């Protein structure tokens, strides 16, 4: 995995875009191109590592480092955050079905990839929605890894962490795999077609949240979901890991029923007023879906 060396110089820093945990991301410029820095010792060498080893369009781009002062230099993402994107400060910008799978197909690629490394896989074990940025006018995805938490105050107990998309094997303290990803994707599937923060019903803090995944709580169905869509969601939910699909499968299956789902490569550029009503409804519409599926099925 090669890698540019950066004098320090070349940079010139324009905002801090991200704070918590093990660094400070920002904002910069670095030979015309728009960058991402995160700035710091010690597992930084087995993120660099990784980071040079991946080569993947759904995953982060990694430019170079800049040993002293020691920081990784990125891609920067003109988008942002999908939880921004989802969840964020108004205007919200509209989305579409096509949108929602496409995101989720991407992510869901990038993800098969880190678990088909040789000769070890990478468990990514913390995707969610704050991880994932935008691209290309919103079209395209690329996961991160921000790492948000270590203090269980400020930080793995709070809206700071991520026991919302934590698989249960997980934070219960067994044994897991790369299954536990796909858990996560399940939950992240769900989000973007409700546009609901994952048991925001529950709250108070993160244990609660994980109290209530491990009796087997999970997000509420959604009305008028095809029934596929649904098979899918609820399989990587699944409390034991061996009845989850592989990241693998997913690909296969979702790369095949955008054919159901055109327009995903159309840009983010329409407002929306967004607001929320035993089942819960979708924010994207599933009409034209059953239109086309009609024709083919018909
Ligand atoms: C809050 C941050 C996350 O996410 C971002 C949020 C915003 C954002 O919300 N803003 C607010 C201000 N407005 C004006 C624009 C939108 C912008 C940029 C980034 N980050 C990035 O562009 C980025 C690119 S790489 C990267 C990053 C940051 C930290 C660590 C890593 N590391 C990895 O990706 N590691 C890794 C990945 C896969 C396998 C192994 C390691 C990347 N961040």
Known sequence: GPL???????????????????????KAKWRAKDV??????????????????????????LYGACLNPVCLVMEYAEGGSLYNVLHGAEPLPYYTAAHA???????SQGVAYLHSMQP??????????????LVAGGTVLKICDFGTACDIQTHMTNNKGSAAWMAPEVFEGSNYSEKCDVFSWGIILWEVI??????????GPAFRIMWAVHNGTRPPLIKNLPKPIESLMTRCWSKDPSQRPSMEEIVKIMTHLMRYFPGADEPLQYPCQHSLPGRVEPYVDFAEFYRLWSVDHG
């Open 101 to 107: 799978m496409s995101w989720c197909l991407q992510c």
């Open 120 to 133: 070890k896989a990478l468990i990514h074990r913390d995707l969610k929605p704050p991880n994932l940025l």
């Open 4 to 26: 540019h060396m950066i004098d320090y110089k070349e940079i010139e820093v324009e905002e801090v875009v991200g704070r918590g945990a093990f660094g400070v991301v920002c």
């Open 194 to 203: 409700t546009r609901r923060k994952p048991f925001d019903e529950i709250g």
């Open 36 to 61: 991402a820095i995160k700035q710091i010792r010690k597992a930084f060498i087995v993120e660099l590592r990784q980071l040079s080893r991946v080569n993947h369009p759904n995953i982060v781009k």
